[PDB]
Design a protein around this ligand. Structure first.
Ligand SMILES: Nc1ncnc2c1ncn2[C@@H]1O[C@H](COP(=O)(O)OP(=O)(O)O)[C@@H](O)[C@H]1O
Ligand SMILES: *c1nc2c(N)ncnc2n1[C@@H]1O[C@H](CO)[C@@H](O)[C@H]1O
Ligand SMILES: O=C(O)C[C@@](O)(C(=O)O)[C@@H](O)C(=O)O
Ligand SMILES: [Mg+2]
Lengths: 323, 427
């Protein structure tokens, strides 16, 4: 689909009564020196059209809360992103309805627990309309200097700690939400920091896959290297191997797949993510990591060496003037 | 996640709900037997067990039972009881899993030729559901079956099945095969299956017999499907047993949007984890095992999604109860770890853990439990303080680390590979 999803001018609608996540977005906005809040409005069916207090820096301001999505859309035609905090029961309906509004180009789906058969339908329709789905079951992602999905990256002290208020040159994609904030921390300690990070969520069929974002990153000139935190389950990571073999993927990629421990268990263990289940030998973390390594991907020995190889690749990119 | 169901569960659902023009034979003719069965009562409930010969086989998510000598074919009831004597209640290894054979199924034997065995499978992928058919069903099924992708919004009519899938099928069987498969596919969809395999499906002059069934359903669809699923059960893999702690934690997980998950791998293991986050909990597990400790890893478990202090206390109390059931020469270890949380209130959660440590301080000391903590996220400094504080006020040794330590370093610590750097405490 698209290459750029977010900018410092991106305006979002939040579906749901998530004043903490919205406030945290606005705090991010303010220290990134955005001209305007990234949340134009909130939709909440459980209440009628009203207004919520929020803080823009020290200044109290007002975000409109709408009962109907069609009002929010019509009033705020500048919005091209929706962050859907609808519970699992409602997420399918509201997400289908969002994609009746051509202004929306990206949807984050936060909820865990959406049936896979429904997510596949979401994917068919998103694919139809060119809409980019991040999720489900994800905290979202963060584009330093530009935009933050929901709770991603936590409160200000962490935004400042990991230097997520300006872009570096390292993009990443993760299945894990919590680990995306670890990557934020590792990358910022080993490089000039994150350019863009996306958590695709743990579900069997994520709305956008690893390769979806790896390609976007390959085509973003601000991106000079790419990190992928893969995971046992499915065969997505092999598309990376393909994308290098074909010459489509030229920027250095570091990648590590979690779930190696599953090879050592005498019985199948379902980890926390709904997709983190190998159904054939190739779906194992160990097999995937080994295939990535032979394809030209920079693969550390264990998660423990992850930071070290990132830094290794980054330093060589500086030495040769790519960064 | 998608979760396997027993053959018995799947067959009851199919017998209840499939719509076909086919006469499906032997509906609901199956009996369940365990080491505790009252066979007099069994035969009171299932007089058909005397009416013809039988088949007996374990119903515990074991594949390839025939190749394992675990299918008793064409036996009298007495022949069944003889076949079960060396098996029922016995420990058995399948692949690399070891468990007790404790749950078996008995069904009418169905005479037929090998030409009457058919393979049918339906399984989910991103782009839709594949439907597989082969006119060589059976244990020797071994890129040779007919296979058709049914798209996310596509329908599968008998007419489509004869067209795409039944090309190699006996002409006289096409109509009944097509009807059954269309019905099976409708059943599969309406009840949110993600995998459904019947190998073999038998079709004789008398109709359609379902001799074997393996299936997974998308357990997240309970809210849609509960009326038809009923009190559906999701058995552990062969090789594991179910503990009330797991069912306890699961009940907790079902009440809030917060995730709370526990799997016991080795109750006698000295290495326990209470990690925040799906990915992180995996990673720590990866590390504990990369560092040799797989045989001592007691559990896979993760909380996340901002559990309340109460939810967090009740999780931790379960862990602390399970590692104080039995002492160990070398004591025990607890890895209280996680990434840098995005939004989980570390102070609220660790205050739940502290209070649980406080309640179990006595037992924890008598099992020589040593605790290692690493965590980031909202209010994590106050989180760490209260872990250090309970450590002093109980005598337990708690080693508290922050965003300045690498996430998994604490595991190398807890296992002796590396020294404990006290120059990173609470940082
Ligand atoms: N009720 C039955 N009547 C006749 N043969 C049966 C019956 N159930 C199973 N069989 C035969 O036994 C073989 C093994 O049984 P099956 O239930 O498919 O277990 P598995 O697939 O685990 O080997 C089948 O291929 C079939 O030929
Ligand atoms: C069911 N069938 C039984 C036989 N044959 N032997 C022993 N126990 C049997 N049960 C149990 O009794 C309950 C009904 O009173 C069933 O739910 C089952 O647990
Ligand atoms: O507590 C964590 O470290 C994970 C999480 O609760 C978070 O706060 O970041 C959330 O990301 C999840 O794992 O679902
Ligand atoms: Mg999760």
């Amino acid at each position: 689909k698209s290459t750029t999803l977010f900018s410092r001018h991106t305006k979002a609608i939040v579906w749901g009564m998530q004043t903490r996540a919205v406030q945290g977005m606005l705090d991010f906005d303010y220290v990134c020196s955005r001209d305007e809040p990234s949340v134009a409005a909130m939709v909440y069916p459980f209440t009628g059209d009203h207004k919520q207090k929020f803080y823009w820096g020290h200044k109290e301001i007002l975000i409109p809360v709408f009962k109907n999505m069609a009002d929010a859309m019509r009033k705020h035609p500048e919005v091209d992103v929706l962050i859907n905090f609808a519970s699992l029961r409602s997420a399918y309906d509201s997400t289908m309805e969002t994609m009746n509004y051509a202004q929306i180009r990206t949807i984050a789906i936060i909820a865990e627990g959406i049936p896979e058969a429904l997510t596949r339908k979401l994917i068919k329709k998103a694919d139809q309309k060119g809409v980019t789905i991040i999720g489900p079951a994800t905290v979202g992602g963060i584009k330093p200097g530009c935009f933050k999905i929901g709770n991603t990256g936590g409160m200000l002290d962490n935004i400042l700690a990991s230097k997520l208020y300006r872009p570096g040159s390292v993009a990443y994609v993760s299945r894990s939400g919590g680990m995306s904030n670890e990557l934020n921390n590792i990358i910022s300690r080993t490089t000039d920091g994150v350019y863009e990070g996306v958590a695709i969520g743990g579900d069997r069929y994520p709305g956008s896959t690893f390769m979806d974002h790896v390609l976007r990153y390959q085509d973003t000139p601000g991106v000079k290297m790419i990190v992928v935190l893969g995971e046992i389950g499915g065969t997505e990571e092999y598309k990376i191997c393909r994308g290098i073999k074909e010459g489509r993927l030229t920027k250095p990629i570091v990648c590590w797949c979690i779930g190696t421990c599953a090879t050592m268990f005498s019985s199948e263990v379902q980890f926390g993510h709904a997709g983190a289940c190998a159904n054939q030998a190739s779906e194992t973390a160990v097999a995937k990591n080994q295939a990535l390594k032979e394809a030209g991907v920079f693969v550390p020995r264990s998660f423990d060496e992850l930071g070290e190889i990132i830094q290794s690749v980054y330093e060589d990119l500086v030495a040769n003037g790519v960064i | 996640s998608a979760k396997a169901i027993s053959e018995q569960t799947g067959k009851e659902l199919l017998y209840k709900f499939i719509c076909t023009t086919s006469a499906i034979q032997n509906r609901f003719k199956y009996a369940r037997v365990t080491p505790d069965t009252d066979w007099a009562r069994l035969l009171q409930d299932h007089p058909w067990l005397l009416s013809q010969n039988l088949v007996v086989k374990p119903d515990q998510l074991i594949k390839r039972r025939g190749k394992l000598g675990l299918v008793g074919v064409n036996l009298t009831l007495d022949g069944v009881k003889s076949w079960l004597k060396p098996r029922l209640g016995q420990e058995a290894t399948v692949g690399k899993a070891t468990g007790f054979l404790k749950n078996f199924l008995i069904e009418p034997f169905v005479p037929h030729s090998q030409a009457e065995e058919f393979y049918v499978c339906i399984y989910a992928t991103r782009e839709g559901d594949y439907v597989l058919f082969h006119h060589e069903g059976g244990v020797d099924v071994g890129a040779k079956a007919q296979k058709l992708l049914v798209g996310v919004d596509e329908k599968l009519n008998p007419e489509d099945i004869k067209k795409h899938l039944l090309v190699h099928a006996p002409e006289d069987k096409k109509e009944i095969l097509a009807s059954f498969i269309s019905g099976l596919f409708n059943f599969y969809e309406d009840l949110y299956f993600t995998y459904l395999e019947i190998n073999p499906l038998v079709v004789t002059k008398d109709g359609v017999y379902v001799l074997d069934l393996a299936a997974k359903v998308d357990a997240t669809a309970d809210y849609i499907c509960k009326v038809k699923w009923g009190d559906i059960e999701f058995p552990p893999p062969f090789g594991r047993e179910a503990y009330p702690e797991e069912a306890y934690i699961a009940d907790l997980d079902a009440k809030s949007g917060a995730s709370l998950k526990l799997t016991l791998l080795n109750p006698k293991g000295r290495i326990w984890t209470m990690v925040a986050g799906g990915g992180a909990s995996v990673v720590y597990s990866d590390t504990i095992c990369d560092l040799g400790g797989v045989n001592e890893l007691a559990n896979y478990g993760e909380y996340s999604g901002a559990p309340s202090e109460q939810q967090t206390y009740d999780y931790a109390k379960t862990i602390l109860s399970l590692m104080t059931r039995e002492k160990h020469p070398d004591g025990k270890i607890l890895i209280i770890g996680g990434s840098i949380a995005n939004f989980t209130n570390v102070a609220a959660t660790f205050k739940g853990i502290v209070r649980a440590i406080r309640d179990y301080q006595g037992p924890l000391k008598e099992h020589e439990v040593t605790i290692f903590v690493r965590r980031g996220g909202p209010n994590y400094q106050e989180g760490l303080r209260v872990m250090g504080e309970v450590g002093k006020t109980t005598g337990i040794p708690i080693h508290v680390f922050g965003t300045e330590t690498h996430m998994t370093a604490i595991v190398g610590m807890a296992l002796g590979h590396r020294p404990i750097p006290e120059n990173l405490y609470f940082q």
